[PDB]
Each structure stands twice: as C-alpha cells, then as structure tokens.
Amino acid sequence: EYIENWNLQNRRQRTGFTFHKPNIFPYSASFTLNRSQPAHDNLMGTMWLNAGSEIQVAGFDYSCAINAPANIQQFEHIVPLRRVLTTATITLLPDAERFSFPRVINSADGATTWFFNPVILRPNNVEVEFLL
C-alpha cells in the first residue's frame, strides 16, 4: 500500500490510504459556557471530547429551557479536520456517555470549581452535516 501510494504520488495521480479508526481529531477535552455566572449555579453550554476517531459532545442547560423561546435550546459543535476524509463509514449515536455522570470541573480560568449533575434527555432535531 505505502510503496504504491508513493509511486502514484510521484506520478502525480490520486493516492489513498485506508484507515480503520483514523486519529484525525487532535486530542481536545473542553467546554464552552454561553450562559454563566460566578457561582456556576445556572449554566448553559456544551462540553466535548474529540479524541482519535471519536467526537463526544453534550449540550447542557441547567434550567431545562424554562425561559428559552419555545422551550428549545440550540447547541452546535464544529470539528474541522486537518485533511479531507473520503468514503468514511461513521457511527452516530444519540447519547454522550462520557458526560452523563456527576462531575466537578474547574472554571475556565482555573479560579474555582463548578458542579455538573446531568440528567439525560433525548437530543431533539439532530442534524449532522459533513462539509467540504
């Protein structure tokens, strides 16, 4: 495979390496808070782990969209890749098992710690877009 791709590249033709679980996502584990207070008692935002060949994302809202318009809170997560992937088989499942247990996280600037006691609901209007 590798020598033939080498020769193809030198001949200036299309190459391709087939990967099983490609490590295309740089390791990242972080959260973004769209609504926040110093006390971290009422938060809305997302948390994510992009690792190897997996993306786990979880949008959380402490008020459960009580005051949101139409009682719906929208969450987005964009993962750009460093190289274009073709003919990819993907498994998409509706729960982020990594963000479904109580946690004590450290604040964005590291000053303090905040609590995350999740209760899992079904994700509504799930859209996954693959863009080139």
Closest by CA to 103, choosing from 112, 94, 114, is 114
Interface residue with a second copy, options 15, 32, 57, 62 (CB under 8 A):
15
Residues 6-65 that bind other proteins (CB under 8 A): 27-39, 41-42, 45, 47, 49
Q: How far is the CB of 90 from other proteins (least distance, A)?
A: 17
Q: Are 95 and 88 in contact (CB under 8 A)?
A: no
CA distance 130 to 22: 17
Q: Which two tokens stand for residue 71?
A: 């009682």
48 to each of 9, 25, 74, 119, how far by Cα in Å? 36, 12, 15, 17
Q: Is 94 in the site for a second copy (CB under 8 A)?
A: yes
Query: Residues marked as binding?
Result: 20
| Chosen from a second copy, other proteins, none, partner binding at 42 (C-beta under 5 to 8 Å by type) | other proteins
Q: Which spans of this chain sit near other proteins (rule: CB under 8 A)?
A: 27-39, 41-42, 45, 47, 49, 69-70, 72, 74, 94, 105-111, 122, 124-125, 127
